[PDB]
Write a protein that binds this ligand. Structure first.
Ligand SMILES: O=Cc1ccccc1
Ligand SMILES: O=Cc1ccccc1
Ligand SMILES: O=Cc1ccccc1
Ligand SMILES: O=Cc1ccccc1
Ligand SMILES: O=Cc1ccccc1
Ligand SMILES: O=Cc1ccccc1
Ligand SMILES: O=Cc1ccccc1
Ligand SMILES: O=Cc1ccccc1
Ligand SMILES: [Cl-]
Ligand SMILES: [Cl-]
Ligand SMILES: [Cl-]
Ligand SMILES: [Cl-]
Lengths: 162, 162, 166, 162
């Protein structure tokens, strides 16, 4: 019912995310992650810290965050343009089923949800994603969570990018 | 001597490119691809044509091209923003050695080279990349081929993004 | 048809006559990119009588702090700024202006770092009620680096008698 | 003789002040207003009280006072930071001549001059400014009054600001 008490499933192995690539966010909190494609990237072989990278792609715009495991099934993100950190958790994951992948992740501002990302690669047909959104929408600030794929730009021959 | 008669090695399997992720371009033709990270993406599970996607990331800007294999060891690109096509080839590839990956690819304007991209994930240490750049520079328009990683922006805690 | 995708492709309307800006004084920045220009009031100033270069000045006022930039017209409907404190220059443009309407003034202005937006200032004097402003912000947020653009007027310090200053 | 007996010329229309923007203070009492530029601002469109604002700008610092007309050719100020009040008068004004603008204003501690400001946009060439300063100095505490543009910071390419 409040953000700090939401579920926190274990972060799947990185390989499970990469096998899901690319995804799209079906539901998000702020406007930032509307009409967005997610790509996960393994650490560079010469990276000293071996952090993976999450790519949030909206047309010609890209938002990049290295991330690593933290306590309590957290993912600690480092914004690659600013160096600021954010602590994220997974409400649920359901990766690489025979009907594809979905998950919902979130980051808190105390008892408020500061951001929400529900990703899938199956046109939003995972029944888990429905249940999860309904729960998160009732958390403080979660009234803002909305469907993120209405009236997105037209494509020019590519399926996942525009 | 001329672009049309450069080497055309077999395109490696996609998984070889993905296992090399992420790469940087050490030598390019146009300055669009300066200070750039390359990430490859598998086709979306629901994508009708099953085209892979090359991501060309320069700080906060991303260029995306779907691609599929064509005749004569070619890759056919589809710019996701404009819908413009281009036929590309690999001069050589050397992916996933015990010293990492490098390759050089090119597209032609008849006998001149229109674009050149030499990627690696080993700080430019593959012998083959030296040989291959010197050859491509000697072709019509390869005077414009330059080292692409001079004076790039400073990072904020991420290894391969800025 | 489709929004501009990089900062270099944003619209560039004519810089209104200085006098239209001065008649809009003072304005507040509803949306900005860096945090520097949160809780900020804009005042335009004509060139001084004895100004050798006849540059106007934009004042960005945050409580008891001020940032100042001389500006002059440039090619392609640019304004070229000179930071009065550092001598740093920057080429700006207007995404739109809608000054001195029956519902007041708004505009949005920007400066690019190539294809990314480096700074963004949307000002108004009508409590953010201009529909043009809202659509301008949506377009600008979508270019590289535009995700940092944010509402700039939350949790600003308490005033002590004055409407536009604090 | 005494501050309470100084001239009190009419407050010029606000448009006359704004047409004079910007000015510098050639003489002041307190060193607070040394090396200082004056800018006048019209009331905000939605200001309920419709007070104008006087801006005192010294490098990167600014003092702001809302002001309205009051009894006896007075301007009543409201410090925007402190909420504090001052009653000021004009000793003279000489706005928008063919040689530019000048004026001198003052506020009193009874018979002592509390603060004094003489502004101009013509490098202090207005004969009226000379005579008005000479007179102000002979007032109790008017010994403090000094040429205020000695030893001011160097500029970085702007005429009226630093
Ligand atoms: O953007 C959110 C996120 C969450 C977990 C891992 C990577 C990224
Ligand atoms: O059509 C967009 C898209 C992107 C990623 C996954 C699935 C669909
Ligand atoms: O950017 C060029 C390229 C070449 C081959 C495959 C994918 C992309
Ligand atoms: O060679 C290392 C490297 C650096 C940046 C991005 C990708 C790879
Ligand atoms: O501070 C931004 C700016 C832009 C155009 C004109 C004046 C100021
Ligand atoms: O929108 C009105 C306003 C408020 C404070 C300062 C300037 C303008
Ligand atoms: O600071 C002095 C003053 C006097 C009259 C009007 C505005 C300001
Ligand atoms: O350079 C100082 C200055 C400031 C305002 C008006 C005239 C001159
Ligand atoms: Cl996520
Ligand atoms: Cl390539
Ligand atoms: Cl501006
Ligand atoms: Cl004054």
């Amino acid at each position: 019912m409040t953000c700090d008490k939401l579920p926190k499933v274990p972060v799947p192995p990185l390989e499970e995310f990469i096998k899901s690539n690319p995804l799209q966010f079906a539901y998000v909190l702020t406007d930032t992650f509307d009409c967005t494609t997610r790509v996960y990237v393994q650490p560079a072989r010469l990276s000293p810290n071996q952090a993976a990278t999450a790519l949030d792609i909206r047309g010609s715009r890209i938002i990049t965050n290295d991330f690593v495991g933290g306590p309590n099934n957290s993912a600690i993100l480092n914004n690659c343009t600013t160096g600021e950190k954010a602590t994220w958790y997974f409400q649920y994951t359901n990766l690489n089923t025979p009907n594809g992948s979905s998950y919902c992740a979130y980051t808190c501002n105390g008892e408020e949800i500061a951001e929400y990302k529900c990703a899938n690669n199956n046109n939003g047909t995972d029944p888990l994603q429905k249940q999860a959104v309904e729960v998160a929408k009732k958390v403080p600030n979660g009234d803002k969570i909305h469907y993120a794929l209405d009236n997105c730009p037209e494509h020019h021959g590519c399926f996942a990018f525009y």
